[PDB]
Short mmCIF file of C-alpha atoms and ligand atoms in Angstrom, two decimals:
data_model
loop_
_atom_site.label_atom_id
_atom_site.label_comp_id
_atom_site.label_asym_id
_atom_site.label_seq_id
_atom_site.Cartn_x
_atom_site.Cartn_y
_atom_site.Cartn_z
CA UNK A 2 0.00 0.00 0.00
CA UNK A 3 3.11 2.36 0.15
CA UNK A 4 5.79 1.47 -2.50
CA UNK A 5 9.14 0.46 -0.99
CA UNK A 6 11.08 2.83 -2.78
CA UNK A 7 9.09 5.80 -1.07
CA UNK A 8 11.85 8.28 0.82
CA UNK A 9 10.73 8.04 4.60
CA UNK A 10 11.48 10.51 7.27
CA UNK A 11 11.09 9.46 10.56
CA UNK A 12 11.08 11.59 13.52
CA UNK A 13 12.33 11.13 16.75
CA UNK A 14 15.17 8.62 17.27
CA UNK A 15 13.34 7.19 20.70
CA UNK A 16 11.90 3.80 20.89
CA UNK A 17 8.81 4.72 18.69
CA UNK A 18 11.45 5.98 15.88
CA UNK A 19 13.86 3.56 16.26
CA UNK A 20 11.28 0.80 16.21
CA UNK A 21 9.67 2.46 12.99
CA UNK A 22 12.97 1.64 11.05
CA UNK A 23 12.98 -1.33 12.20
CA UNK A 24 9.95 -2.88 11.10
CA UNK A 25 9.79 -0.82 8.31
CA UNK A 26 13.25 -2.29 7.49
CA UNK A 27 12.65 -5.94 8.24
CA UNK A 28 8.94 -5.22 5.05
CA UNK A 29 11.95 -4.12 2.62
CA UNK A 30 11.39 -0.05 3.03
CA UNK A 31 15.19 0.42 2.69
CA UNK A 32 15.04 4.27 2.42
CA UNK A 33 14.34 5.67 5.32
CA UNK A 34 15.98 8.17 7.66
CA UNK A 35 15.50 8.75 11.32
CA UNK A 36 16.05 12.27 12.25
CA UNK A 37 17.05 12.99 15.83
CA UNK A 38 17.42 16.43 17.77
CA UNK A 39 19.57 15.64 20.87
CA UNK A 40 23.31 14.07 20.60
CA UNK A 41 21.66 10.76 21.53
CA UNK A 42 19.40 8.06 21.13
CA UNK A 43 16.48 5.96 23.20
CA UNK A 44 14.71 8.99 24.57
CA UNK A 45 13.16 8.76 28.21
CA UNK A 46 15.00 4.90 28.02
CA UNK A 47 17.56 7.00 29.57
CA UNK A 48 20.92 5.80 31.05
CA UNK A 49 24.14 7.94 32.01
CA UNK A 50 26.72 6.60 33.81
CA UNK A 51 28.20 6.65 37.22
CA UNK A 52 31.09 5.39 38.96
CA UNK A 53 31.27 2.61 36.27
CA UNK A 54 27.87 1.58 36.30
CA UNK A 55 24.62 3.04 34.44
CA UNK A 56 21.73 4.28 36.52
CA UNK A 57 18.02 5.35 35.17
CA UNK A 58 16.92 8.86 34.37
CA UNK A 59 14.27 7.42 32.75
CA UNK A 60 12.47 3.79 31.93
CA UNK A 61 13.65 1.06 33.98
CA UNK A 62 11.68 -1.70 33.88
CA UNK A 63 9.41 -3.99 31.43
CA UNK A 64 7.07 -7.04 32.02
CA UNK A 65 7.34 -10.56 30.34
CA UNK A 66 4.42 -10.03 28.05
CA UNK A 67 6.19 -7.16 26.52
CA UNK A 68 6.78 -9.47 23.04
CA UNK A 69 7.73 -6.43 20.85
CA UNK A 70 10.39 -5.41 23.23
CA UNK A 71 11.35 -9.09 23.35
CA UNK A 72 11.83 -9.15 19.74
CA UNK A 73 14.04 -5.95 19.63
CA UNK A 74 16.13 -7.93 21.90
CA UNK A 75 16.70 -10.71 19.42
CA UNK A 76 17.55 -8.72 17.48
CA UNK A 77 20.16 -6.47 18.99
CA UNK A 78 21.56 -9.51 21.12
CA UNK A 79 20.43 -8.02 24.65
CA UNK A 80 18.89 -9.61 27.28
CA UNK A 81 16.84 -8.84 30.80
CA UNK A 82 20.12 -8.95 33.13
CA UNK A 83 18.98 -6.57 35.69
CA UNK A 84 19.07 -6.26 39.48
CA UNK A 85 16.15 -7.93 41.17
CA UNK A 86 13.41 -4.94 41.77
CA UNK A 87 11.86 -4.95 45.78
CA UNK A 88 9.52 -2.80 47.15
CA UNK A 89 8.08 -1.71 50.32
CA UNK A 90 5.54 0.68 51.40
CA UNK A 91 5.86 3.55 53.86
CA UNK A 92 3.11 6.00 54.82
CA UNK A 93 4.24 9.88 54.38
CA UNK A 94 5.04 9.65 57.69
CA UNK A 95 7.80 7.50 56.50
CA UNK A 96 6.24 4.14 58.82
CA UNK A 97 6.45 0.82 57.12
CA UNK A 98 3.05 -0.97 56.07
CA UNK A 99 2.08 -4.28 54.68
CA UNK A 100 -0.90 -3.86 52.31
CA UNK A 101 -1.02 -6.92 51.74
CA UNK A 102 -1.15 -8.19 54.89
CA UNK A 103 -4.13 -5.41 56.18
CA UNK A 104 -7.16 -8.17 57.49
CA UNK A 105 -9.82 -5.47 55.97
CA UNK A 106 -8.49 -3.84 53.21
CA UNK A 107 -6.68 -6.45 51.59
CA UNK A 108 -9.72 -8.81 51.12
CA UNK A 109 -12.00 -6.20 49.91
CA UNK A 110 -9.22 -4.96 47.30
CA UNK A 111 -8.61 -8.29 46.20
CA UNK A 112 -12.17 -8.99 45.38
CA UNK A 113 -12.35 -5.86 43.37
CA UNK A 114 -9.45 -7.28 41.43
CA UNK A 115 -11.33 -10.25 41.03
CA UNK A 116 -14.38 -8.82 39.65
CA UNK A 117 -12.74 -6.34 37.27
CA UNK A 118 -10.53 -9.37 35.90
CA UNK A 119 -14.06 -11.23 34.59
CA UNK A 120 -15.29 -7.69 33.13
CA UNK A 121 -12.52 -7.42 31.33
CA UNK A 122 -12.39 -10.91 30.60
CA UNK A 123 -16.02 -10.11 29.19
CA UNK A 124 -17.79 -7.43 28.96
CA UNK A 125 -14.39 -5.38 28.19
CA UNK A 126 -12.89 -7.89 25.52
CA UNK A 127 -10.35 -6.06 23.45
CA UNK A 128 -9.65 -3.59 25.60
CA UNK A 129 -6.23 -4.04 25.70
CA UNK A 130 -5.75 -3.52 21.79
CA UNK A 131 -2.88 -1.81 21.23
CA UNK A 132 -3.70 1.62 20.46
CA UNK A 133 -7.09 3.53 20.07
CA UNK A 134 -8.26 2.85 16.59
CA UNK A 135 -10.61 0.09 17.56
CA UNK A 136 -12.97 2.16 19.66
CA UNK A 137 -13.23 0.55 22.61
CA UNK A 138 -16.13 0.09 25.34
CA UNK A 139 -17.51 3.88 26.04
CA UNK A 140 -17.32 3.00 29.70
CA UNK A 141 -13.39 3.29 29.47
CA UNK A 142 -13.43 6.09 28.16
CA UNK A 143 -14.54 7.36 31.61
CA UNK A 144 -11.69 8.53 34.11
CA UNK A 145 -10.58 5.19 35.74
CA UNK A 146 -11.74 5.94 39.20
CA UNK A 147 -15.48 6.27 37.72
CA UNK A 148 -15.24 3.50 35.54
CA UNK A 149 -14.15 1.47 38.66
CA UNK A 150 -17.03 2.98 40.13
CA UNK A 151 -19.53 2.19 37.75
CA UNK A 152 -18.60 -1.56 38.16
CA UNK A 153 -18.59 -1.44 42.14
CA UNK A 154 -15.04 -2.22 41.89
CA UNK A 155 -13.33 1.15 43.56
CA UNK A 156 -10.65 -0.81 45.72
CA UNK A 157 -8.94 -2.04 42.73
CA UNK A 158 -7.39 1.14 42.59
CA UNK A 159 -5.14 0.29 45.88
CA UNK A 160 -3.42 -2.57 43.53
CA UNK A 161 -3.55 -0.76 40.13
CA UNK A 162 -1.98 3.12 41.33
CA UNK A 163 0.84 2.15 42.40
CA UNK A 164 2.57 1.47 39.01
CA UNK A 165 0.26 4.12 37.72
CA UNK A 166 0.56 7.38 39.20
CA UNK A 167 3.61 6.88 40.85
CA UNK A 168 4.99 5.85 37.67
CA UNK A 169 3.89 9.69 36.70
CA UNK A 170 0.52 8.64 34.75
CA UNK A 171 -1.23 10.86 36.86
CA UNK A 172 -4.50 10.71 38.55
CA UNK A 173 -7.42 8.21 38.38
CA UNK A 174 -10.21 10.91 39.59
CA UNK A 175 -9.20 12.04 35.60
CA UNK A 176 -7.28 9.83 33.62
CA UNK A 177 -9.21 7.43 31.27
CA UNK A 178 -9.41 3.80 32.21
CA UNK A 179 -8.14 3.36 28.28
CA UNK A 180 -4.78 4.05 29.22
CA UNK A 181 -4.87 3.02 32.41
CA UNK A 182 -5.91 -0.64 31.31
CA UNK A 183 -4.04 -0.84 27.87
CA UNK A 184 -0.76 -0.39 30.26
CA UNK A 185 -1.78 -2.27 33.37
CA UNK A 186 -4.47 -4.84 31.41
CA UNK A 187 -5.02 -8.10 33.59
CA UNK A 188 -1.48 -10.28 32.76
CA UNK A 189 0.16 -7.13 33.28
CA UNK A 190 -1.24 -5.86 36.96
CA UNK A 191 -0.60 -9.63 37.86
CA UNK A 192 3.41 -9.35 36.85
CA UNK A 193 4.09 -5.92 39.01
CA UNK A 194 1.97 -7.60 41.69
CA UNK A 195 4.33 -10.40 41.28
CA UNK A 196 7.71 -8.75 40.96
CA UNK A 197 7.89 -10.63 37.72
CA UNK A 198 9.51 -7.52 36.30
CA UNK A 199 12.29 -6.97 33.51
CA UNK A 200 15.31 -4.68 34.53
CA UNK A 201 18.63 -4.15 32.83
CA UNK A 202 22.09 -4.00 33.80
CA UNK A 203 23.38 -1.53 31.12
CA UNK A 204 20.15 0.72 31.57
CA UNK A 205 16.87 0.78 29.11
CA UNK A 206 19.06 2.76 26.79
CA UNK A 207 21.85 0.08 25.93
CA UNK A 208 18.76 -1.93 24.03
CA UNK A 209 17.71 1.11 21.90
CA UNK A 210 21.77 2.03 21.35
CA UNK A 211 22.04 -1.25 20.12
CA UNK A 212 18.82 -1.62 17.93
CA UNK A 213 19.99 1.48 16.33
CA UNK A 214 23.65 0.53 15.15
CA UNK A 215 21.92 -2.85 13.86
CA UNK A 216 19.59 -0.57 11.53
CA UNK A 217 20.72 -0.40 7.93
CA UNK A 218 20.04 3.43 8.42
CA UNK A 219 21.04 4.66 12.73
CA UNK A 220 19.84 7.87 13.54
CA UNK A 221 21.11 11.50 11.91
CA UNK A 222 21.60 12.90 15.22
CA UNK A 223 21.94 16.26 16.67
CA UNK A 224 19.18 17.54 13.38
CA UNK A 225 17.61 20.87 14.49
CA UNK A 226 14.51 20.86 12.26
CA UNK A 227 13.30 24.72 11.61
CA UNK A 228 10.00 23.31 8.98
CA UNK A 229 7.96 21.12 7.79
CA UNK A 230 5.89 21.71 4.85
CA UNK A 231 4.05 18.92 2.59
CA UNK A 232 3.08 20.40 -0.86
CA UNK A 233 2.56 18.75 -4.29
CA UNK A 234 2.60 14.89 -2.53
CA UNK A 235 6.11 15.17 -0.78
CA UNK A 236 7.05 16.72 2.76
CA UNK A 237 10.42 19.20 2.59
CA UNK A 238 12.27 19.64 5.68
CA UNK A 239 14.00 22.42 6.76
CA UNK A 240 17.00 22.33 8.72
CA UNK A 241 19.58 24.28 10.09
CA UNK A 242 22.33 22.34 7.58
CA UNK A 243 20.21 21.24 5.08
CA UNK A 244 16.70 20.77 3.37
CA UNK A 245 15.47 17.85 1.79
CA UNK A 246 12.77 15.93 0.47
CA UNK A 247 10.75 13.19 1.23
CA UNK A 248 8.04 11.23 0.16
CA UNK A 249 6.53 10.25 3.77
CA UNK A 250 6.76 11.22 6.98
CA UNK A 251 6.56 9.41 10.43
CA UNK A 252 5.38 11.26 13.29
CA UNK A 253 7.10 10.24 16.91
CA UNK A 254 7.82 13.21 18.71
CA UNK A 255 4.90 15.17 20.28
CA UNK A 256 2.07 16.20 17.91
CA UNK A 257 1.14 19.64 19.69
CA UNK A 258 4.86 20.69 19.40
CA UNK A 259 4.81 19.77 15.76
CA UNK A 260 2.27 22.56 15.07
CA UNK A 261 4.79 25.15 15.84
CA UNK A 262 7.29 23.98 13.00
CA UNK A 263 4.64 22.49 10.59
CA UNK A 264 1.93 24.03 7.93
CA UNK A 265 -0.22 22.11 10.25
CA UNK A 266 -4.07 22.24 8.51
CA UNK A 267 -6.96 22.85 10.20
CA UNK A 268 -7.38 19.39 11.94
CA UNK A 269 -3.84 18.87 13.30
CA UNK A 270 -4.37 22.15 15.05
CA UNK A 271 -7.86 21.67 16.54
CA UNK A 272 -6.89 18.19 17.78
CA UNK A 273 -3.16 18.08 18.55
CA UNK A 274 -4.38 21.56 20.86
CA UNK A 275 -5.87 19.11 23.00
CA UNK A 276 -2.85 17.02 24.35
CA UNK A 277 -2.57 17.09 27.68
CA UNK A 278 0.80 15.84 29.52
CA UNK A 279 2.20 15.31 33.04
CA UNK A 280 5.59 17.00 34.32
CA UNK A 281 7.25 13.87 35.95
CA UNK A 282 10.52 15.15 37.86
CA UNK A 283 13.18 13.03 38.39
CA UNK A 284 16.07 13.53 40.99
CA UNK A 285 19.73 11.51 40.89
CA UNK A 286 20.72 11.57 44.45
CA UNK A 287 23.33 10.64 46.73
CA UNK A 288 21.84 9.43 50.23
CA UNK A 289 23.23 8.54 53.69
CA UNK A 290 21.40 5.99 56.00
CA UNK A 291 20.96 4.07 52.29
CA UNK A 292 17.90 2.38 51.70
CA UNK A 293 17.66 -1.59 52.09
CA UNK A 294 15.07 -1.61 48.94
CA UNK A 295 12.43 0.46 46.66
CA UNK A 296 9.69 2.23 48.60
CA UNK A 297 6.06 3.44 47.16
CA UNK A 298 4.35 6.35 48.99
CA UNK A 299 0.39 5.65 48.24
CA UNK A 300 -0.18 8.45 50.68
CA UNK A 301 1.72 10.58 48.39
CA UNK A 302 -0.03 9.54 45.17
CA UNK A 303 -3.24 11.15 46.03
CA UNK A 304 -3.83 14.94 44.32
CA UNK A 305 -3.45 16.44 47.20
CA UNK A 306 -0.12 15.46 48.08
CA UNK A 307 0.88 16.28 44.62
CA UNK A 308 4.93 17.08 44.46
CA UNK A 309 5.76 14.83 47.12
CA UNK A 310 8.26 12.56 46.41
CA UNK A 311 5.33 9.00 45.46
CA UNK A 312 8.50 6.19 45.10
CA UNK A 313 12.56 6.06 45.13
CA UNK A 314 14.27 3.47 43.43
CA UNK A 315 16.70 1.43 45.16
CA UNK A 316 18.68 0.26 41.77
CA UNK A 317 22.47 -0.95 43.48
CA UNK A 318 21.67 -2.77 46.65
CA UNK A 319 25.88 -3.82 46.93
CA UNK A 320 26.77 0.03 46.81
CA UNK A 321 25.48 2.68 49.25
CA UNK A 322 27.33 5.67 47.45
CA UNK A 323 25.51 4.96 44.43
CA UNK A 324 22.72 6.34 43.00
CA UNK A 325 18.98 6.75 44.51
CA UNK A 326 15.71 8.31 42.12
CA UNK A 327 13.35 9.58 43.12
CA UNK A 328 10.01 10.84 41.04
CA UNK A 329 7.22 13.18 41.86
CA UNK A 330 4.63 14.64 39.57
CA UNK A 331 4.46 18.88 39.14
CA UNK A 332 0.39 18.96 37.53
CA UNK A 333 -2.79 17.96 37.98
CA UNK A 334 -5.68 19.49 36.42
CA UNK A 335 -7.73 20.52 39.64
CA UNK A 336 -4.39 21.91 41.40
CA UNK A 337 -2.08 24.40 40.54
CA UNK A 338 1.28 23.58 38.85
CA UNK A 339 3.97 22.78 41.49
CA UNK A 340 7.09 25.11 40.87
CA UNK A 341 10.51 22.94 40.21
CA UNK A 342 11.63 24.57 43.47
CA UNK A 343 9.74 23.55 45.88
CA UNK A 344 9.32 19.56 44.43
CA UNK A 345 12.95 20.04 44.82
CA UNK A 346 12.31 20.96 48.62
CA UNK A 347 10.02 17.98 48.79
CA UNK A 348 12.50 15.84 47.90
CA UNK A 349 14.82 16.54 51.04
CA UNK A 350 12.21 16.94 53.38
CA UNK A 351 10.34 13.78 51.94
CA UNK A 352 13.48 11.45 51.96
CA UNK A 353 14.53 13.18 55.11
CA UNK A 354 11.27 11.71 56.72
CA UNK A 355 11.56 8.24 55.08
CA UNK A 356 15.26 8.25 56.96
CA UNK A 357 17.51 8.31 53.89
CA UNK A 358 18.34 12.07 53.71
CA UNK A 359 19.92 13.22 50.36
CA UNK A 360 23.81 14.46 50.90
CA UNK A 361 23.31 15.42 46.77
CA UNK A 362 21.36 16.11 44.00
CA UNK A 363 23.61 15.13 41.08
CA UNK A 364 21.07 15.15 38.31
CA UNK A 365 17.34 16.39 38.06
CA UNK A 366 14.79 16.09 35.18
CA UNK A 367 11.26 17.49 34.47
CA UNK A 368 10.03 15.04 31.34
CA UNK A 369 7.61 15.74 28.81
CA UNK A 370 5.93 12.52 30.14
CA UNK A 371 2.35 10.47 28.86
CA UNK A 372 0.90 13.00 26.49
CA UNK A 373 -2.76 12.09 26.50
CA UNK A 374 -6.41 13.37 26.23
CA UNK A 375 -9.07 14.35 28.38
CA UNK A 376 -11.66 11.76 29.08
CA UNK A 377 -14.42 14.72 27.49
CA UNK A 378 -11.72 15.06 24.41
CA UNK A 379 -11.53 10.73 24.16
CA UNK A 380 -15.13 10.53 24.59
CA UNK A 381 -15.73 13.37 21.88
CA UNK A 382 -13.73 10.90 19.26
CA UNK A 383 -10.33 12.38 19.25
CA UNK A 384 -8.78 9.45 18.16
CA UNK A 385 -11.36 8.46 15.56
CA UNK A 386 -10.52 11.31 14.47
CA UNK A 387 -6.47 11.14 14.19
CA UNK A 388 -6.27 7.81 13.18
CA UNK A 389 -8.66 9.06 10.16
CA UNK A 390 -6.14 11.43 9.46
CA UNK A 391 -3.35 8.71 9.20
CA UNK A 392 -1.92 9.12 5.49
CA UNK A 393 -3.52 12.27 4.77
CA UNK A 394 -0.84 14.54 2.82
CA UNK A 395 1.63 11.13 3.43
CA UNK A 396 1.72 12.09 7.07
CA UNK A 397 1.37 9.34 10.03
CA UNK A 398 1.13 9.57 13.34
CA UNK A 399 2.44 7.67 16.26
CA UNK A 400 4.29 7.78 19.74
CA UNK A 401 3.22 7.91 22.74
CA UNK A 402 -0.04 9.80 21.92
CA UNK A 403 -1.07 7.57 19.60
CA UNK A 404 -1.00 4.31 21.97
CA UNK A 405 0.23 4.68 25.72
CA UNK A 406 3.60 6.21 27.51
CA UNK A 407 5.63 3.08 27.51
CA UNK A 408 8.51 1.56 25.86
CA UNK A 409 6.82 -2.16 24.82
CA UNK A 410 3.14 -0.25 23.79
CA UNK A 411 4.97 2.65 21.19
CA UNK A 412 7.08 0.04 19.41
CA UNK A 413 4.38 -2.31 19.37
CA UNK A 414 2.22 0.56 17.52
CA UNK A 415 5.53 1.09 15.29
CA UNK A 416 5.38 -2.26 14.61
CA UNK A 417 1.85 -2.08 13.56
CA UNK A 418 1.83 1.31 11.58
CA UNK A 419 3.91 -0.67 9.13
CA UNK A 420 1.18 -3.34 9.14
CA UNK A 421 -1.66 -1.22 8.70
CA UNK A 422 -0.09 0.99 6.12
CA UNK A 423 2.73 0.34 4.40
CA UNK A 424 3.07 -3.21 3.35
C1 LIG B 501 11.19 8.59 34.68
C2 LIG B 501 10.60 7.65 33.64
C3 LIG B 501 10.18 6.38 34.00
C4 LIG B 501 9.63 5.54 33.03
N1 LIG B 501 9.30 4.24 33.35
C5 LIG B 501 8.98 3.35 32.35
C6 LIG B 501 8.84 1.99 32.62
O1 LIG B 501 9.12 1.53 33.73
N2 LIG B 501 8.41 1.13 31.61
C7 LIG B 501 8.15 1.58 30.35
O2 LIG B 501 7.77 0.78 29.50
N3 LIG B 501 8.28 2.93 30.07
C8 LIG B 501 8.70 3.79 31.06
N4 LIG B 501 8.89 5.11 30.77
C9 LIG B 501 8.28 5.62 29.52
C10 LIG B 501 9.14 5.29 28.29
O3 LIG B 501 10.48 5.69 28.52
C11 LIG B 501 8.58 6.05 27.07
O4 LIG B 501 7.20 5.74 26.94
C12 LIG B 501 9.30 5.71 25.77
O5 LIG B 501 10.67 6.10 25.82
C13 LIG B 501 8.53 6.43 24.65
O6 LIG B 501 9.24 6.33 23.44
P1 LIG B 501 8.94 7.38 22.25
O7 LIG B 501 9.94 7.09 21.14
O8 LIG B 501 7.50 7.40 21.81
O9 LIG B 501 9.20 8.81 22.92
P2 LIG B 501 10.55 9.43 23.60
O10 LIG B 501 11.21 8.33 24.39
O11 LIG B 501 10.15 10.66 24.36
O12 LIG B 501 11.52 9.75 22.35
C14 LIG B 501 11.20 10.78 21.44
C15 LIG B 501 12.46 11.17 20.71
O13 LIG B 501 12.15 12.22 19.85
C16 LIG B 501 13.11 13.22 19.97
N5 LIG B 501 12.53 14.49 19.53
C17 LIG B 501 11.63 15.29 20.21
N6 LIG B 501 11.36 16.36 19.43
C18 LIG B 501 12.07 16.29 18.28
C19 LIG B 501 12.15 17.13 17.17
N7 LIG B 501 11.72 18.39 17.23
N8 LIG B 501 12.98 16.76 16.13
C20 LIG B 501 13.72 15.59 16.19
N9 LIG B 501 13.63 14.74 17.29
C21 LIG B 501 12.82 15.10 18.33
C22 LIG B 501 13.57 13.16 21.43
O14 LIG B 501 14.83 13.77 21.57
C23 LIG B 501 13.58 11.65 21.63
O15 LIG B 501 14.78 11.04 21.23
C24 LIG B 501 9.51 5.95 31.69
C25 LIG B 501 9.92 7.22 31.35
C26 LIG B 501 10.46 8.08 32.32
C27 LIG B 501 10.89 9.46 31.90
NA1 LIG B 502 23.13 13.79 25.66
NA1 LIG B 503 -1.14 -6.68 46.62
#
């Protein structure tokens, strides 16, 4: 349906990008080109070094149901060699508790799991679709807190936020139950719950370093692109060294930003105004009274608490002078936006009270994180809408926006873009 000679620009050199060449590689679309702004590549899978070891500004873990990621592994040669992830829970007071192990709670969250497992098993069948373009039930299109409402099953939300919000999603009193359950769907709840998680020695990033210098075409890197314009069939790109052609382009940065170097028509504008996306702050520290594992801060999760510091992640057990993360969230829409200074404030005082004060801040990072829509926007057809759009002036659209904010679900739609329509 697209003719393998066709010149493809692809842009964005993170796992969405990368991925794109890939598959569009491995169906015989030799010419392409992967354009990238910064001096590197694998985006938020993001892994500097550190006293001879890499630590995570960014992604850190998958799940063993994450088959696209699985296959980018065979192909670079990488494999799931990663320290062991533990976790335990601490109120904001910084006590210990054992969820788990709470007589009342535990049963009645439990049972909700239960009973949101067979809805989704039934009434909710295909839910977990990659991407949006096979509408799904109009009941998850509902913030997840009222579609776990609707269904009587509101303490599933005790198991399901805490790789959720603390994982910088956001909130459930806003954020639709489409996302929420196209990341976390059933098999994948049950491996968090588990600890059957994936982590990586080398960092998230080595993979993505590697699947690029196995491409036929790696990543133009450090490309500062000034336009966009798509006349007479082909897209031109403007740069700050050059300008060239191109018959097609690939879309995996964010779409709203796009607008402002773009002849974006009429639709792009009206729709890609309406992405939404969270402020996750990351800070590299340097602790005394090290940590013995991970800890998750439910207390902190809830909007009101927003900019506290929800989990740290205890990544070198062997090593108390390395590195400790932690992540908050900045926005909300009911609250005002938290300034970078006092998060930062909340991350000494927080850690202070969970008895691992921070001697340093080494590195700190506010991410463009899980660009999304409203649940009025979703509900309203936005992606109906979009995904109509896909091929219209031999434009498509994909990242993050387009599926969910994780590694395995934007290289699965990657994978699938190519599917849909290019072979
Ligand atoms: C703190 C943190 C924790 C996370 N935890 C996990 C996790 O545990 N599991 C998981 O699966 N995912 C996790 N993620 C999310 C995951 O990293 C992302 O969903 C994934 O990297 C998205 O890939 P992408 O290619 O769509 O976007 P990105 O990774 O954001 O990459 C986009 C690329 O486009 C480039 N770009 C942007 N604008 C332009 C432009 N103007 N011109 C050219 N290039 C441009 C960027 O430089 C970047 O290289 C985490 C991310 C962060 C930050
Ligand atoms: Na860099
Ligand atoms: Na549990």
């Amino acid at each position: 349906s697209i003719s393998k000679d066709s010149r493809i620009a692809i842009i964005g050199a993170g796992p969405a990008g990368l991925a794109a060449g890939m598959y569009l590689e491995q169906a015989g679309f030799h010419d392409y080109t992967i354009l990238e702004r910064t001096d590197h590549v694998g985006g938020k899978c993001h892994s500097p070094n550190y006293h001879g070891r890499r630590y995570e500004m960014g992604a850190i873990m998958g799940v063993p149901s994450y088959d696209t990621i699985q296959e980018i592994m065979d192909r670079t040669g990488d494999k799931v060699d990663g320290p062991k992830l533990r976790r335990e829970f601490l109120h904001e007071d910084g006590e210990i508790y054992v969820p788990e192990k709470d007589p009342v709670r535990g049963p009645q969250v439990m049972a909700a799991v239960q009973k949101l497992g067979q809805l989704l098993a039934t009434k909710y069948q295909g839910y977990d679709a990659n991407g949006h373009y096979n509408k799904v039930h109009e009941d998850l299109m509902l913030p997840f807190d009222e579609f776990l409402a609707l269904n009587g099953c509101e303490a599933a939300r005790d198991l399901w936020i805490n790789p959720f919000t603390a994982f910088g999603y956001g909130h459930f009193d806003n954020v639709p139950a489409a996302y929420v359950l196209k990341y976390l769907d059933f098999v994948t709840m049950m491996s968090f719950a588990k600890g059957d998680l994936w982590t990586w020695a080398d960092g998230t990033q080595a993979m993505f370093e590697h699947l690029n210098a196995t491409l036929e075409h790696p990543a133009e890197r450090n490309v500062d692109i000034t336009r966009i314009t798509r006349e007479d069939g082909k897209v031109h790109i403007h740069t700050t060294d050059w300008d060239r052609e191109s018959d097609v382009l690939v879309l995996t940065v964010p779409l709203e930003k796009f607008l402002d170097y773009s002849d974006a028509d009429d639709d792009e504008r009206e729709y890609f105004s309406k992405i939404i996306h969270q402020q996750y702050m990351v800070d590299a520290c340097l602790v005394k009274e090290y940590p013995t594992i991970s800890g998750y801060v439910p207390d902190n999760m809830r909007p009101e608490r927003l900019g506290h510091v929800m989990v740290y992640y205890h990544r070198w057990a062997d090593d108390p002078h390395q590195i400790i993360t932690t992540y908050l969230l900045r926005n909300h829409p009911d609250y005002a936006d938290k300034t970078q200074e006092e998060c930062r404030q909340m991350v000494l005082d927080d850690m202070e009270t969970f008895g691992h004060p921070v001697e340093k801040i080494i590195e700190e990072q506010t991410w463009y994180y899980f660009p999304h829509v409203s649940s009025e926007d979703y509900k309203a057809g936005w992606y109906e809408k979009v995904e109509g759009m896909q091929g219209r002036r031999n434009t498509f659209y994909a990242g993050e926006i387009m599926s969910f904010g994780n590694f395995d679900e934007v290289c699965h739609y990657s994978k699938d873009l190519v599917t849909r329509f290019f072979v």
